[PDB]
Amino acid sequence: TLTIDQLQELLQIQKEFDDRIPTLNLRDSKIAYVVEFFEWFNTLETGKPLDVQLDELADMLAFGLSIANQSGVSLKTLGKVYFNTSSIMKDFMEDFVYFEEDSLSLPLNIAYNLYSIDQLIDAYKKKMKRNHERQ
Amino acid sequence: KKREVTIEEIGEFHEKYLKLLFTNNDRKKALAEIEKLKEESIYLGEKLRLVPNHHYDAIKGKPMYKLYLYEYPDRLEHQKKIIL
């Protein structure tokens, strides 16, 4: 269940979406991402129902897909293991307070550890359908 | 008065929200901070209302300002009540 180059199915889906958004830019993607990390971090006990957690998680993922995409991650192709919730805090905090790659690495490595990873994807593909529809 | 919300203040706010939920028995200084945190919540809501994060509304289906104008203040209210 744990992923193997579904990067061409997500980087595109989101590429797909963001092209329907005229005013799109990088400073805002960055903010929405940060807001979703805390929004997700909130959905835990430091708790809330399972269903409701990977929704925020999926929401963070879409923004990480945008960053690298707006960065033009030139064909870059890391799976990390996390022992505690606080070990995810630390990570985000230096990629943030002291600084693209890690920004997209992060929602996924959570999936590996916090959840299944082929179980996050089903939330993302579902919403972006409802989203591409809305726009 | 620079209109557009900066990445760093947005970051500062959520951080303070988390320190708040970790204060832990006569510490009544936490309640002050909730009062502070409600007000800058409104501050941020109004700014984002006037000048919105666009990508956020498109991916979320809801205006980002509402999260600061209404949901966090709701939450900080919930913590206020939990008290005795």
Residue numbers in the entry:
A (entry chain A): 4 to 49, 58 to 88, 97 to 118, 122 to 157
B (entry chain B): 175 to 198, 203 to 262
Please quote the authors directly.
The Staphylococcus aureus pathogenicity islands (SaPIs) are the prototypical members of the phage-inducible chromosomal island (PICI) family of mobile genetic elements. Stl is a DNA-binding protein that binds to the intergenic promoter region between stl and str (the SaPI transcription rightward regulator), preventing transcription of the str and downstream genes, thus maintaining integration of the island in the host chromosome. The remarkable ability of the SaPIbov1 Stl to target unrelated but functionally similar antirepressor proteins relies on the modularity of this repressor. In this way, SaPIbov1 Stl presents three domains: one corresponds to an HTH N-terminal domain required to recognize and bind the divergent stl-str region present in the SaPI genome; a second (middle) domain responsible for interacting with the trimeric Duts, while the C-terminal part of the protein recognizes the dimeric Duts.
The structure of BovI-StlC-ter in complex with the Dut of phage ϕO11 (DutϕO11) at 2.9 Å was solved by molecular replacement using the structures of each individual component previously solved by our groups (4 and this manuscript). To form the BovI-StlC-ter–DutϕO11 heterocomplex, both proteins exploit their own homodimerization structural elements in such a way that each protein is reciprocally mimicking the other partner. Stl provides the N-terminal part of its dimerization helices α11 and α13, while DutϕO11 contributes with the dimerization helices α2 and α5, generating a surface of interaction of about 1100 Å2. Superimposition of the BovI-StlC-ter components of the DutϕO11–Stl heterocomplex and the BovI-StlC-ter homodimer shows that the Stl helices α11 and α13 of the second chain in the Stl homodimer occupy similar positions to the DutϕO11 helices α2 and α5, confirming structural mimicry as the molecular mechanism used by Stl to interact with dimeric Duts. Additionally, the Stl projects a long loop that connects Stl helices α12 and α13 into the nucleotide-binding site of DutϕO11. This loop (residues 230–241), which was unstructured in the free form of BovI-Stl, acquires a single turn helix conformation and resembles the DutϕO11 “latch” that comes from one subunit to conform and cover the active centre of the second Dut subunit in the dimeric Dut homodimer. However, this BovI-Stl “latch” is inserted into the active centre of DutϕO11 and occupies the position of the nucleotide. BovI-Stl residues H233 and I237 mimic the pyrimidine ring interactions, with the former residue interacting with the DutϕO11 Q17 and D21, and the second with DutϕO11 F20 and F74. Finally, the interactions of dUTP Mg-triphosphate moiety, which is recognized mainly by the DutϕO11 acid catalytic tetrad comprising E39, E42, E67 and D704, are mimicked by BovI-Stl residues Y234 and K238 from the latch and R253 from helix α13.
